[PDB]
Ligand binder design. Structure first.
Ligand SMILES: NC(=O)C1=CN([C@@H]2O[C@H](COP(=O)(O)OP(=O)(O)OC[C@H]3O[C@@H](n4cnc5c(N)ncnc54)[C@H](O)[C@@H]3O)[C@@H](O)[C@H]2O)C=CC1
Ligand SMILES: Cc1cc2nc3c(=O)[nH]c(=O)nc-3n(C[C@H](O)[C@H](O)[C@H](O)COP(=O)(O)O)c2cc1C
Ligand code: SF4
Ligand code: FES
Lengths: 85, 213, 430
């Protein structure tokens, strides 16, 4: 989860097409590889508003805390018995 | 020796296996030993029962044990490939199991393994061409003070010399069944030159019983 | 008492250890078994647990946990679930054949131990997980259990005490790891015998999900004798925290390999030369002794001269007591071949569940198989030591420890013999 730590700003992907000579991915988009890194969401929003970029924000999707129990694999009456180990 | 199955014509889910009805009553008595709702706990006896009716486990005994216990067939395949008794290949009618761990290797189980090899004309893992003797090499059978020893199908043959195992094989080829005991002078596990203990008669009920009982 | 051993025949628990008397019910009641069992049952769980705590009984399975402290984990109120005593009758340890003798020759003692122990722990039934290889012993035990039901000693209103108690026998199917208590639980439940992690301990989550105490055949069978003879009688043998009597299996390179009941802190040399007729070729022919079955580190001749056969004096001798199974090895032994065969046993008997045992026990078997031939160099000895220290302590159950300890004992006491083996390989193959 070390790649899910900091906020990122990317841009909309523009056209990539085939080079007629070699078959490479040609582009006309200067901002096609521009990925910016921000500590918090509001620093990213402030950097987008400072540069006149129309932005949209997706909120951080955090994994909810699960209830883990090893002995629950070996219950008396519940369906959470494992059939093998 | 493999742990994946390939359908041979004699081992497939269309191989005829089915229990006898007295074995169905035995399976009912097995399943009544476990709590209601834990019928899967009867996988290990019933499958072993399938090894006693048939001699080995095709993949129809495993599927039948899976079906009559309402367990998935993989959960029977795991039990069949985990535990070393379940013969997933047909063995001979007498399944000779020589123990070669350290308390038996120190008392020369190598000479007895060589004796069974040079007697039957086979080696470890092979079955004799009449399908009567299968020789393999097993770990500690739990008869260490009676070393060296072998197991044949239920029975421990203990304190063996190569002549003793030659004679046991000779009378297994003749149809009789020998006595599962130490082929030396002693009876079960006592010191071989007479009792060093338990010579006095046992006391009986009431001896040494504390007050207030 | 200061010197221990020379146990008297009147002070024996396992009378008819040798099969010389009638193992059935009319023979067993004529030897003190099933006598005043109802008066043991009626005095409650707390009295029986106190008599087991007073006696100082430790776990005869081999780890030596205090038996009263272990069984008092069940003295707790019912939470709807039933409670189970489970008898560990697997006995897969090389060297160890004592539980075979208890089941084969004193089966009613085990059945009365099931009844008394399950009364102490409030248990509903006894699942005797017997070894699958012990078929004749299992039918032997089933005959005794039929005799116990037909006499009304167990079952409905067991011994006339108003206590309902069943005794079941589950046969194994050929796995040494199914003697480990959680893997034995998983084997009773119809699965692969793979050990559970701890916690939950089996007193919390055990067989079928129930409160469950797994205990050895010996620590269960000696419990009616502790209840009848008193706990102080059992604590009056052996050293302090090393109380009682013990079955010993002296096998290997002795004159008379045998099972013997002996007092707890007996000297090893006295036990060997008194009950087994001594080492073959004399005591000066002694090379090593594996004191307590395969899992314990071996000890050489200079430790075997003075050592006591209990838990604590063998821990101080940097080995363990274990199952008190004495494997004696004379000077004619290729000791590397014996230890490498023992490591081969531990890779054949290893359930494959966690990484350090599944990979490192096979890797130790490959290294030990090259050490037999000497096809190595001395820097691989210390490396092998490190491999054992990466298996020991990091595994789920103690079979990784029991695979690491023979390697560590062989290195610690016979590093020069390994080095001369490898240098003579080097000078005869180069
Ligand atoms: N008799 C035989 O055939 C064999 C015996 N062994 C012996 O087994 C020993 C290892 O046994 P283990 O059970 O793995 O060792 P040990 O760490 O776990 O535990 C011994 C007993 O004490 C109980 N216990 C310990 N701490 C507890 C706690 N905090 N709460 C509740 N219960 C607790 C456990 O449930 C177990 O029954 C080895 O030292 C070896 O001597 C090994 C192989 C074969
Ligand atoms: C790999 C392994 C195998 C074991 N096998 C047995 C066994 O066969 N019989 C036994 O009584 N204990 C065996 N034990 C010890 C048990 O874990 C447990 O401590 C014992 O069975 C019950 O506790 P007790 O010593 O108080 O009776 C084994 C332990 C391990 C790690
Ligand atoms: S260390 Fe070995 S014996 Fe233990 S759980 Fe892992 S594979 Fe099993
Ligand atoms: S070592 Fe062969 S029976 Fe235990």
């Amino acid at each position: 989860v070390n790649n899910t730590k900091k906020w990122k700003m990317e841009f909309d992907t523009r056209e990539r097409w085939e080079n007629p000579l070699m078959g490479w991915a040609s582009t006309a988009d200067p901002l096609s590889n521009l990925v910016l890194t921000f500590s918090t969401k509001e620093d990213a929003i402030a950097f987008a508003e400072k540069n006149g970029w129309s932005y949209d924000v997706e909120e951080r999707k955090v994994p909810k805390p699960k209830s883990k129990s090893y002995g629950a694999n070996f219950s008396w009456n519940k369906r959470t018995r494992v059939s093998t180990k | 020796a493999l742990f994946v199955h390939r359908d041979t014509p004699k081992n497939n889910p269309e191989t005829p296996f089915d229990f006898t009805p007295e074995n169905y009553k035995r399976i009912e008595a097995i399943v009544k030993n476990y709590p209601e709702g834990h019928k899967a706990a009867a996988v290990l006896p019933v499958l072993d029962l399938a090894q006693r009716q048939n001699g080995w486990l095709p993949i129809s005994a495993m599927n039948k044990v899976a079906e009559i216990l309402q367990v998935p067939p993989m959960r029977v395949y795991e039990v069949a490939t985990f535990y070393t008794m379940y013969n997933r290949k047909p063995v001979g009618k007498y399944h000779i199991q020589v123990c070669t761990t350290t308390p038996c290797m120190l008392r020369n189980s190598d000479s007895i393994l060589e004796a069974i090899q040079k007697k039957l004309g086979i080696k470890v893992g092979e079955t004799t061409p009449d399908k009567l003797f299968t020789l393999i090499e097993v770990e500690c059978l739990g008869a260490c003070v009676n070393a060296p020893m072998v197991q044949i199908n239920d029975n421990y043959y203990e304190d063996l010399t190569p002549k003793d195992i030659e004679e046991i094989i000779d009378e297994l080829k003749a149809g009789k069944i020998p006595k599962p005991g130490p082929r030396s002078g002693r009876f079960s596990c006592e010191p071989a030159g007479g009792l060093t203990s338990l010579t006095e008669p046992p006391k009986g009920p009431g001896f040494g019983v504390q007050a207030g009982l | 008492k200061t010197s221990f051993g020379s146990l008297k025949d009147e002070d024996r628990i396992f009378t008819n250890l040798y099969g010389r008397h009638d193992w059935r019910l009319k023979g067993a009641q004529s030897r003190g078994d099933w006598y005043k069992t109802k008066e043991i049952l009626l005095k409650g769980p707390d009295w029986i647990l106190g008599e087991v705590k007073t006696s100082g009984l430790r776990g005869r399975g081999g780890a030596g946990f205090p038996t009263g402290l272990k069984w008092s984990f069940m003295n707790k109120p019912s939470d709807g679930r039933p409670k189970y005593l489970v008898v560990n009758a697997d006995e897969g340890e090389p060297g160890t054949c004592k539980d075979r003798e208890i089941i084969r020759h004193d089966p009613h003692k085990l059945v009365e131990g099931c009844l008394v122990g399950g009364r102490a722990m409030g248990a509903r039934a006894a699942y005797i997980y017997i070894r699958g290889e012990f078929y004749n012993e299992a039918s032997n035990l089933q005959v005794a259990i039929r005799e116990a039901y037909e006499a009304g000693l167990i079952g409905k209103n067991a011994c006339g005490s108003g206590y309902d108690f069943d005794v079941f026998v589950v046969r194994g199917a050929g796995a040494y790891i199914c003697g480990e208590e959680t893997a034995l639980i998983e084997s009773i439940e119809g699965k692969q015998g793979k050990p559970r992690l701890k916690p939950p301990f089996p007193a919390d989550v055990g067989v079928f999900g129930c409160p469950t105490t797994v205990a050895n055949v010996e620590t269960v069978a000696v419990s009616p004798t502790i209840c009848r003879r008193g706990g102080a009688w059992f604590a009056s043998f052996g050293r302090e925290r090393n109380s009682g009597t013990k079955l010993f299996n002296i096998s290997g390179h002795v004159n008379n390999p045998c099972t013997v009941e002996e007092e707890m802190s007996v000297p090893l040399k006295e036990l060997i030369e008194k009950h087994a007729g001594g080492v073959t070729g004399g005591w000066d022919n002694l090379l090593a002794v594996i004191p307590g079955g395969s899992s314990t580190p071996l000890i050489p001749k200079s430790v075997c001269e003075t050592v006591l056969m209990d838990f604590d004096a063998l821990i101080q001798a940097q080995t363990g007591l274990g199952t008190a199974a004495v494997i004696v090895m004379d000077r004619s032994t290729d000791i590397v071949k014996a230890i490498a065969r023992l490591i081969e046993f531990y890779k054949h008997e290893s359930c494959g569940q966690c990484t350090p045992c599944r990979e490192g026990v096979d890797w130790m078997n490959k290294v030990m198989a090259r050490f037999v031939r000497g096809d190595a160099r001395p820097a691989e000895i210390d490396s092998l030591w490190e491999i054992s220290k990466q298996i020991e302590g990091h595994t789920i159950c103690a079979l990784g420890d029991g695979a690491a300890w023979p390697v560590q004992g062989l290195i610690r006491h016979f590093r020069p013999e390994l080095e001369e083996r490898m240098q003579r390989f080097a000078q005869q193959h180069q």
